[PDB]
From Swiss-Prot, chain D:
UniProt KW keywords: Acetylation, Cytoplasm, Nucleus, Proteasome
Protein known as: Probable proteasome subunit alpha type-7
Source organism: Saccharomyces cerevisiae (strain ATCC 204508 / S288c) (Baker's yeast)
More details: Present with 12000 molecules/cell in log phase SD medium.
Gene Ontology terms, MF aspect: mRNA binding
Reported function: The proteasome degrades poly-ubiquitinated proteins in the cytoplasm and in the nucleus. It is essential for the regulated turnover of proteins and for the removal of misfolded proteins. The proteasome is a multicatalytic proteinase complex that is characterized by its ability to cleave peptides with Arg, Phe, Tyr, Leu, and Glu adjacent to the leaving group at neutral or slightly basic pH. It has an ATP-dependent proteolytic activity.
Subunit structure: The 26S proteasome consists of a 20S proteasome core and two 19S regulatory subunits. The 20S proteasome core is composed of 28 subunits that are arranged in four stacked rings, resulting in a barrel-shaped structure. The two end rings are each formed by seven alpha subunits, and the two central rings are each formed by seven beta subunits. The catalytic chamber with the active sites is on the inside of the barrel.
Family recorded in the similarity comment: Belongs to the peptidase T1A family.
Post-translational modification: The alpha and beta forms are probably products of the same gene with different post-translational modifications.
The encoding gene: PRE10
Residues forming coiled coils: none
UniProtKB/Swiss-Prot annotation, chain E:
Gene: PRE6
Organism lineage: Eukaryota, Fungi, Dikarya, Ascomycota, Saccharomycotina
Record-annotated membrane-spanning stretches: none
Remaining remarks: Present with 16800 molecules/cell in log phase SD medium.
Subunit structure comment from the entry: The 26S proteasome consists of a 20S proteasome core and two 19S regulatory subunits. The 20S proteasome core is composed of 28 subunits that are arranged in four stacked rings, resulting in a barrel-shaped structure. The two end rings are each formed by seven alpha subunits, and the two central rings are each formed by seven beta subunits. The catalytic chamber with the active sites is on the inside of the barrel. Interacts with CIC1.
Main location as per UniProt: cytoplasm
Keywords: Cytoplasm, Nucleus, Phosphoprotein, Proteasome
GO biological process, one term: proteasomal ubiquitin-independent protein catabolic process
Protein name in UniProt: Proteasome subunit alpha type-4
UniProtKB/Swiss-Prot annotation, chain G:
Organism: Saccharomyces cerevisiae (strain ATCC 204508 / S288c)
Assembly and binders: The 26S proteasome consists of a 20S proteasome core and two 19S regulatory subunits. The 20S proteasome core is composed of 28 subunits that are arranged in four stacked rings, resulting in a barrel-shaped structure. The two end rings are each formed by seven alpha subunits, and the two central rings are each formed by seven beta subunits. The catalytic chamber with the active sites is on the inside of the barrel.
Keywords, in A-Z order: Cytoplasm, Isopeptide bond, Nucleus, Proteasome, Ubl conjugation
Main location: cytoplasm
One record GO biological process: proteasome-mediated ubiquitin-dependent protein catabolic process
Keyword Ubl conjugation annotated: yes
GO CC terms, sorted: nucleus; proteasome complex; proteasome core complex, alpha-subunit complex; proteasome storage granule
Protein name: Proteasome subunit alpha type-2
Annotated gene: PRE8
InterPro entries per the UniProt record, alphabetical: Ntn_hydrolases_N (IPR029055), Proteasome_alpha (IPR050115), Proteasome_alpha-type (IPR023332), Proteasome_asu_N (IPR000426), Proteasome_sua/b (IPR001353)
Residue intervals passing through the bilayer: none
Keyword Coiled coil attributed: no
Positions bearing the Glycyl lysine isopeptide (Lys-Gly) (interchain with G-Cter in ubiquitin) cross-link: 108
Any one Pfam family match given in the protein's UniProt record, by short name: Proteasome
UniProtKB/Swiss-Prot annotation, chain I:
InterPro entries assigned to the protein according to its UniProt record, in alphabetical order: Ntn_hydrolases_N (IPR029055), Proteasome_alpha (IPR050115), Proteasome_alpha-type (IPR023332), Proteasome_asu_N (IPR000426), Proteasome_bsu_CS (IPR016050), Proteasome_sua/b (IPR001353)
Species: Saccharomyces cerevisiae (strain ATCC 204508 / S288c) (Baker's yeast)
Record SMART domains: Proteasome_A_N
Gene transcribed to yield this protein: PRE9
Name assigned to this protein: Proteasome subunit alpha type-3
Record cross-link Glycyl lysine isopeptide (Lys-Gly) (interchain with G-Cter in ubiquitin), residues: 99, 198, 230
Amino acid sequence: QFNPYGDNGGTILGIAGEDFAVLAGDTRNITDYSINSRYEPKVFDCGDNIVMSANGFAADGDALVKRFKNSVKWYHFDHNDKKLSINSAARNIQHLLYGKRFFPYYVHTII
Amino acid sequence: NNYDGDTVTFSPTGRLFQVEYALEAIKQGSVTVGLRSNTHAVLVALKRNADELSSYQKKIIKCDEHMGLSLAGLAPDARVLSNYLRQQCNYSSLVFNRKLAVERAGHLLCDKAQKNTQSYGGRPYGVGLLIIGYDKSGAHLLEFQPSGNVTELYGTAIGARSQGAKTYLERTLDTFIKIDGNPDELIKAGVEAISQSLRDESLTVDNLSIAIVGKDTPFTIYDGEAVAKYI
Amino acid sequence: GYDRHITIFSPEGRLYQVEYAFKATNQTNINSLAVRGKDCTVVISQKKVPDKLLDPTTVSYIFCISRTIGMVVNGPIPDARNAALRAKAEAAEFRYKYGYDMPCDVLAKRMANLSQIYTQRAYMRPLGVILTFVSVDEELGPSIYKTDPAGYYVGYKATATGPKQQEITTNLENHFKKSKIDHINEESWEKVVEFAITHMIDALGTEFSKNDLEVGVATKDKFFTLSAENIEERLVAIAEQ
Amino acid sequence: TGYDLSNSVFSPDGRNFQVEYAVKAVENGTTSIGIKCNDGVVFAVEKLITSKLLVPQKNVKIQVVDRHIGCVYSGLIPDGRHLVNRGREEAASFKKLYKTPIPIPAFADRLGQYVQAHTLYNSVRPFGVSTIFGGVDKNGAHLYMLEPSGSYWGYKGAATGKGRQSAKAELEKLVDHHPEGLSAREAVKQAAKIIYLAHEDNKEKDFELEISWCSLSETNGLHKFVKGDLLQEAIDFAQKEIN
Amino acid sequence: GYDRALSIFSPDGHIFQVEYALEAVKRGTCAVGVKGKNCVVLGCERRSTLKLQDTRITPSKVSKIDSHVVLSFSGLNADSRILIEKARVEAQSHRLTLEDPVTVEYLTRYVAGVQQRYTQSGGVRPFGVSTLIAGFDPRDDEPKLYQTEPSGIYSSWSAQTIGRNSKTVREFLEKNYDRKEPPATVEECVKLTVRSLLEVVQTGAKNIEITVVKPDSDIVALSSEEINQYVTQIEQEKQE
Amino acid sequence: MDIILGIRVQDSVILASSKAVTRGISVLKDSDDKTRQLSPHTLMSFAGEAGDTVQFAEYIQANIQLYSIREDYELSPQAVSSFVRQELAKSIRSRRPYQVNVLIGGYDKKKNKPELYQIDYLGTKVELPYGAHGYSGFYTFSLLDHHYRPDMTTEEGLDLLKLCVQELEKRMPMDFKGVIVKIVDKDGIRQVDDF
Amino acid sequence: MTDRYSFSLTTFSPSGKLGQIDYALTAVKQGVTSLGIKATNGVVIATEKKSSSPLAMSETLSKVSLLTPDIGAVYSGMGPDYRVLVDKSRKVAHTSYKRIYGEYPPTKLLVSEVAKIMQEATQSGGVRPFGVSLLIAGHDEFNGFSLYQVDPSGSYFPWKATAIGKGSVAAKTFLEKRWNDELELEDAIHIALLTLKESVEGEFNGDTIELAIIGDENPDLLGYTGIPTDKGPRFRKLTSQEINDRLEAL
Amino acid sequence: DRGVSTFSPEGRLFQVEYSLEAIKLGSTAIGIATKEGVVLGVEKRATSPLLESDSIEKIVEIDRHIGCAMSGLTADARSMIEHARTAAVTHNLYYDEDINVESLTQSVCDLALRFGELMSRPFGVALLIAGHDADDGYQLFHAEPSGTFYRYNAKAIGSGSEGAQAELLNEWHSSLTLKEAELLVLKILKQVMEEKLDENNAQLSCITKQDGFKIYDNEKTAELIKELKEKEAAE
Amino acid sequence: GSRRYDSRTTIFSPEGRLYQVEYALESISHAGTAIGIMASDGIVLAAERKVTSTLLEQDTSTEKLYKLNDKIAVAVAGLTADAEILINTARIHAQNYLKTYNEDIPVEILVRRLSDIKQGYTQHGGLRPFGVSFIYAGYDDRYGYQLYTSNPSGNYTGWKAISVGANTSAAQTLLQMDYKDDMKVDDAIELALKTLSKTTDSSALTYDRLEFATIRKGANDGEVYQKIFKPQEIKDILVKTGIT
Ligand SMILES: [Cl-]
Ligand SMILES: [Mg+2]
């Protein structure tokens, strides 16, 4: 039977300072016991000083990031180029993820 | 007369009057100018107000990082068509990782406007658009009419008294086409062009609206104190 | 008077749109004729190519609906092709559903029922065509069935259609009074085609070259149209008698 | 009366006045032609230069269907584009199911049935274009002209638009003087001449010439635009003939 | 589906179909609503060209929407049944989700919204009906009386009338009703309602219906004899 | 949910319904009323799947109350039970069926007779002198076969019901936290507060 | 595109007339005369075969149609409208009756279904009424023999005997004089031929007259043997030869 | 008859232009924007003295930071308000923030042209949408049934609009206080109103950053009416 | 488009009337008169057939009087075809109610639903209304014997005695004169026939031009019987009252 999910491995890490924040992630991409790429980035600048990463199943991770980047674009169009605040981005991502509650994005997301 | 009840009816001379009446709404609209060089493309729009207490109706809309238009006529119809363009530009990016060619943008608007002129119940769009953009084949300027007719041009103008600016650009053709690598001078030529369509009123700080796109310039709009430089 | 624009009854119980669709039939100014032999059914029609720039091979009002069924149309070509395509689809579907080739008369009925719907339903206009279907049916033998914009249809011993239809009709009537039979008592289809052309020449009073005619022939298990040279061979035979 | 107010209504003559009114819109449009040749077809069109501000070579009117069919039209330009968009969908579904590219006669009927369908109801308007089109298939070269009624025929030469009678007269001479056939490269040159001669019926604004062609030998059976040296050679030939 | 825009604007800025629906209301039998200090009373005219009627089974003019709210109307009778049904369904639906019966304002607002929807929906004509909706909110002793009309506007009234010759009875109520001191008792409120109908009706026999609504779902309809006593009392005082 | 009983006597119908609402290893509530008044002289008790029970009971209640307002008339217990049965008969062949069993106890004012209907989640209706749903029946039916008489008073019916509760408290595995008892007669519905 | 005619094309005029039904009845008046006569042991329905051309084969065009083995139909008015009604009538006898009860419908109920179809064309969106009047003759076990008329409105009436179309007024008068309650089937056929001769103008023979009966069961026309309860169709179309035999003793 | 979405020869939609005539028949509504807040005021216009004037709801809350006043066929406004309220709350659900006043207005104006042969006709009501957000501050918008909206410093709509707008032209300046704006609305309403202005036939409201959208009591408005009359008599 | 040919069946006149409803009532006023009379111990339904022909099969015919269930019957005035659509709907609605509640449908409920259907055709859908007026005669255990009427507007009312169709004005005056509340069925039978006999457009009232029916409790003990009169039974009742 066809299994729609996979595990692309890797790990990510976010830390917040007083006047800054970091989002780190390794560049390795794998399937089972093979390496697919030694340099495949999964931490992205999404605009409005928001960095994002969706680690787990890379297909679902890329799909989510792509949708969020697109969400930021349409937020500008619909609300007079207003800057999307980090708290507003987070809530927007909740609705993206929960929209697929019964066929989930297999990822642990950090912004 | 008897053949202007709806868009589905031809006149005895082969005319679509509802399309011509939609064309008339553009002539009533405020003037807007478009012009380009080889490196940049510029939109200049005269905004209109209800009275001194009101704001000035925004004429220019952004579609993507590399494309946008100015409007003249029914503003809600411009919002529908610009929204459609935003989606088509966006579809090209997400699916093909490809910036939508300005020529294809025109083709898509033409086909959208056409379907409204051949079916019962619907109506033609009541707005004209001037699309500028920079893509893989350089700078572009389009003129959209709600009949469906889209035209690629070096420069043009639509709205009330647009013939003044259109004549000026027809004279200045050889000059402004070679304003390469100089944004401010191309805008100046556009501001001087729209000035040929002015009567009694002059260009003030909250009246003028300018937009630009080019080689190393995303589509950006200038209003308020940012256009004071060009008065 | 909107009762003349759509297919609803007028005060005198008439459908004017149907009657005006009948007048569209003669818009092409072409006369057709159909007759039956012993083994065959022949249909002939005038071919007029006025423009010199036209490709004369593409100018045709005879259609091959199925392998066995042929159809000639009297009316404008857009409506003619509309009817032809639909008849082809119906004939093909019939074979698939019921496991045997659609008979000429059954297809005529089906197309007539479709024509009837346009006379009752408002949104659909009638087609301005008269469809003459011909075949050698495996049960009924040589068959001619004809459909019109009213949704009427009937079988024929022979028939004619067009502006000068009445002259051709009476010409044929007088022959069957004389011969005392329902068909052309002839062995080969070649001589039945010769009969058809001869009696059209007498009725219309005009002479024909090879490019002035268009001929369709139905035999057992196939319907086919004749080329210019096949007609020329046929015209030579008439002349030498 | 009132028989001309609604589409799909028969007049007492047996005519659809709305379709005849659409023909008037076609007659108003610019001139376009089609020439059938030895092993292919040639298309050409008149593009009126309304203003100096029009970018030359960048308002293309001739359209390609699939890779082997060319379409050109006169009248309401948007209506023509709508018809070509349908043509492309029809040609795509034919190739999808039957593998082979759509034959020209098959393609002609697909447009013909679609245009004819727009004369059957009062909820739609007839097409405001006459469309000249054709190409090369397994059986050779074919040229077709389609009208607002849905009527189409095969042609040796075709012409429509404001200068149709002038172009038809010039086409009839070519058919008479070349019974054995006209070559592809010749047909391109003749096409240029006929557009220039047909421009006499639209001579207020000067114009821009645009030519395309399909040929089994010259273009390998595919539709291509005539550009550069071959275009300028055809323009010069046409310029020499008017003087 | 039938799509036609029947309700549309005219050059002078009027929606004629809505205005013609008001004419149907003006044709209908008179209906009056008067609210007192501790009650509301709904009075209704019944035309006397119909004898040989069966009043047991004939649809009553005042309809219960719930145990605590009532609805009378003027205009097309068949149209009114549709509004009453919809209102009754919404009343039970509100009890089911909010666990509380509707307020009179809420019920009115719903009925008014339905009427409005039929003024800008394709394929439909407006309701040829105006309603008087009266009652008491749950656990509340303040009387409520509202009016609706075909356009969809609604508002609260101390006292109001609708239907044929309603402008005459409104004239009567405008001078006879004191805002500072409404009818203190049930008798006073019923009498003022009957008096107001007697300006228009004809005879006070089987032409007047009276329904009294009191707090906590206390609704009762008066009989012929009970109403006839008010008619007899008013006429004797009049001769002065 | 679990225990719902019904006894029809001479002049009334008595419904007893357990007060416990359990989930997992926790009794969440011990005062739950597993009944709804459908009309002034008709009461329905219910038991089954969590959520479904109350959702179904309230849905039926709304429909009967709507009928009452529309016609200004109370439906007979027979008519209400037939309506309820049909709803359950539809439900059983749905995508997700209501897993709810009910007893309908009512007093017919036209006949001047008490009536008790037992309907399961499949839509299986029966009129009975005494009824029960779930495991309760395995004890109470045989008990009532012995002690029940058709001409008993309401007070005799309550003592007969006490005898059932005592037996269930003795032999049932689960603690059902006693019962709420309600009487349906000519004067309507009332609750016995001390049981 | 799409059928935008979702509204009635038949409406009440100020005088209370339904114009399109009246006009449909006018179309029936223009149509060729047809008739029906009920006997004690059968029913006869007949009409003239108006040939459009002498080259046309009038055998191929059937004005009298079998609906069920025991029910037949004939019309006056528009032939195409009749043809589709016969198709629909045959199908409805199966879908709404035979596929449910395993037997053919009685005459009155099949008539009722045809009427329903014709009524809907009077009220539904974007359609005109049917331009025909039908005469339906039939037999069933519990009602015996029966004859019905169906008009464009969808109204239907049972008749002892009647006529519709061109010369119906004169034909009905003729039938009133001749009809009695003791008529045998052969006597009714004889009267039908006499009545029809009055309205027919040109040739009067078995090739220009179409006539069918609802009489005794016909085991020979069943097509199989072995089931005793199945005894054959009561509907029989009289041949060209069978009509001419009765025209000699006329 | 003729199509609902038909253009006139002058290039305007017939139905939209006719709806504008309906709005002119409506009761007067005035809005004034200041740096201390935006004030909204309306003429109630009771058709009869028996009608309880406090039930006339022509000023309405959309969210805590956005208010709305209407004029014309006020029944048509109910679904527009319903949409506005849902849009505002829905945006707060999706983005955990207050929605911009302009974005709200644009969402309401998208309904306007969704008519034809969607609803059967345009709205017969104009709206004054007043509010505050962090980006563009205190704002006043005029939303029409054409689908167009203009921002205004001050605006009057309804039967006395052209007369009131000419009065607002002279009186408005960029340094108006809230108290000055309250009196100005009352002053201009009293001029254009048929009946004499009081607390029962006119209603005031405002929106401030601190307290949000508030409809004024009849007691509070009455004191502002009394304060207004004294100030005009004082010179 | 198609707008051109739309009659607009569901609109108001400037006076506030529904054109198509008013014209449908004008149609019904030419139909054969139908009378309903309610007595204390039963109900009478009488109706005049529209200009009969001598060759019309009278015994196996149904034009005016139709059975909805065992307890309810209707008399028709208008288009028969239209009435039969509504009758089959009413017959189904009665069986739905019986299936749901295991009780025969109350008369008013059936009448209301049938009247609500007619109402719908006047407010939406763009179709012509049903050109039919009904007289409902029925019994239930709540209100006993009941007479109702409904018309194309979808408005219904209850009656002690009522007429529909032709000459209702004259017929209603005669009923209003001779009717009283303590009346028996046999007396009501006589009144119904006498009224038709005077209001008829025919020369003389005969058995072959009439349909007749009674709803009595004349069965055995506490149960209702519907009697649709046969031709010979109408002949006898016409002689018994002394009309022929
Ligand atoms: Cl068919
Ligand atoms: Mg059970």
